[PDB]
């Protein structure tokens, strides 16, 4: 039948090939991972922009052609991590997987999505520089060698009095300390530091309690967190996956039901059904992976 042209990018590559009207999301996903030689498939998914302009995750047990992908030639998909390990250093197996996590997390730090304090930004940048440039080399890494790099999150640059040049100098000092460090190990060290950031690995959603107070829900590899609207850093209430019997989803509502029956149910409301559906998907996926690491 009539071929459908698609294009899939990962953090550092683009793939372009054709699929058929009957091709399922799983079949497309399978073609992608096999092409790049990635086997740790449980972390990843394909997202696309729907016909209304909303980023959406591709459903694997459904025809690609049946999912309202923005109609264009080629269809555009991004292959990205949807789930994060609990500890990158002990769980990730392949260099490719580790690289794609490094690139994706670094993107979120450099875009200011993931709050990073200044000294951490400098340490992180030093590993990214070691990964990209290799060992510091006086001979070729002369002043301004970091001039065209996005090194530091803009919000960090903005809340301080240092200049671009001075940030570079701080990174260079740390870059010099990493001498001999192989690229894959620099990426791993980067991820070990980022993992410790308070906003790392969390999807945030606007929600309200029954009182109508505006809050945030965070969903991550470890469980659920409830935050006050003005502070995404420090949870007010935490619900580890180990402590959750069930999360019921009814229309716009959610109800977190504890394993400990002596604890009460916690009820929340999300503003749009679209968002609620995605909360459900992330809860399901993270809970499922949580069980695996333990058994």
UniProtKB/Swiss-Prot annotation:
Regulation: A head-to-tail association, of the N-terminal and C-terminal halves results in a closed conformation (inactive form) which is incapable of actin or membrane-binding.
Membrane-spanning segments: none
Predominant subcellular localization, coarse grouping: membrane
Biological role stated in the UniProt entry: Probably involved in connections of major cytoskeletal structures to the plasma membrane. In epithelial cells, required for the formation of microvilli and membrane ruffles on the apical pole. Along with PLEKHG6, required for normal macropinocytosis.
Originating gene: EZR
PTM comment: Phosphorylated by tyrosine-protein kinases. Phosphorylation by ROCK2 suppresses the head-to-tail association of the N-terminal and C-terminal halves resulting in an opened conformation which is capable of actin and membrane-binding.
Full protein name: Ezrin
Any Gene Ontology biological process: cortical microtubule organization
This protein's UniProt keywords: Acetylation, Cell membrane, Cell projection, Cell shape, Coiled coil, Cytoplasm, Cytoskeleton, Membrane, Phosphoprotein, S-nitrosylation
Span within the parent record: 2 to 296 of 586
Subcellular location per the Swiss-Prot or TrEMBL entry: Apical cell membrane; Cell projection; Cell projection, Microvillus membrane; Cell projection, Ruffle membrane
Domain FERM: 1-295
Subunit: Monomer. Homodimer. Interacts with PALS1 and NHERF2. Found in a complex with EZR, PODXL and NHERF2. Interacts with MCC, PLEKHG6, PODXL, SCYL3/PACE1, NHERF1 and TMEM8B. Interacts (when phosphorylated) with FES/FPS. Interacts with dimeric S100P, the interaction may be activating through unmasking of F-actin binding sites. Identified in complexes that contain VIM, EZR, AHNAK, BFSP1, BFSP2, ANK2, PLEC, PRX and spectrin. Detected in a complex composed of at least EZR, AHNAK, PPL and PRX. Interacts with PDPN (via cytoplasmic domain); activates RHOA and promotes epithelial-mesenchymal transition.
Keyword Plastid: no
Topological relation to the membrane, as annotated: Peripheral membrane protein
Residues modified as N6-acetyllysine: 59
Expressing tissues: Expressed in cerebral cortex, basal ganglia, hippocampus, hypophysis, and optic nerve. Weakly expressed in brain stem and diencephalon. Stronger expression was detected in gray matter of frontal lobe compared to white matter (at protein level). Component of the microvilli of intestinal epithelial cells. Preferentially expressed in astrocytes of hippocampus, frontal cortex, thalamus, parahippocampal cortex, amygdala, insula, and corpus callosum. Not detected in neurons in most tissues studied.
Motif ([IL]-x-C-x-x-[DE] motif) on chain: 114-119
Keyword Acetylation: yes
Native species: Homo sapiens
Entry's free-text remark on domains: Has three main structural domains: an N-terminal FERM domain, a central alpha-helical domain and a C-terminal actin-binding domain.
GO CC term (a single one): plasma membrane raft
Phosphotyrosine: residues bearing it: 145
GO molecular function: actin binding; actin filament binding; ATPase binding; cadherin binding; cell adhesion molecule binding; disordered domain specific binding; identical protein binding; microtubule binding
């Amino acid at each position: 039948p009539k071929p459908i042209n698609v294009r899939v990018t990962t953090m550092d590559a683009e793939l372009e090939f054709a699929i058929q009207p009957n091709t399922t999301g799983k079949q497309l996903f399978d073609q992608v991972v096999k092409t790049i030689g990635l086997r740790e498939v449980w972390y990843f998914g394909l997202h696309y922009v729907d016909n209304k302009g909303f980023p959406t995750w591709l459903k694997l047990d459904k025809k690609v052609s049946a999912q309202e992908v923005r109609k264009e030639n080629p269809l555009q998909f991004k292959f990205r991590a949807k789930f994060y390990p609990e500890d990158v250093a002990e769980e990730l197996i392949q260099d490719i997987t580790q690289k794609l996590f490094f690139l994706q997390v670094k993107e979120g730090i450099l875009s200011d999505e993931i709050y990073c304090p200044p000294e951490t930004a400098v340490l992180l940048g030093s590993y990214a520089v070691q990964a990209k440039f290799g060992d510091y080399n006086k001979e070729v890494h002369k002043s301004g060698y970091l001039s065209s790099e996005r090194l530091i999150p803009q919000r960090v640059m903005d809340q301080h009095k240092l200049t671009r040049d001075q940030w570079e100098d701080r990174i260079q000092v740390w870059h010099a300390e990493h001498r001999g460090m192989l690229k894959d190990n620099a990426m791993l060290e980067y991820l070990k530091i980022a993992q410790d950031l308070e906003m790392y690995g969390i999807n945030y959603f606007e929600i309200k309690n029954k009182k109508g107070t505006d809050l945030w829900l965070g969903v991550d590899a470890l469980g659920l967190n409830i935050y006050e609207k003005d502070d995404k850093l420090t949870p007010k209430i935490g619900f580890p996956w180990s402590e959750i019997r069930n999360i019921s989803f009814n229309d716009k509502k959610f109800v977190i039901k504890p394993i400990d029956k002596k604890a009460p149910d916690f009820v929340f409301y999300a503003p749009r059904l679209r968002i609620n559906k995605r909360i459900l998907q992330l809860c399901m996926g993270n809970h499922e992976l949580y069980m695996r690491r333990r058994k």
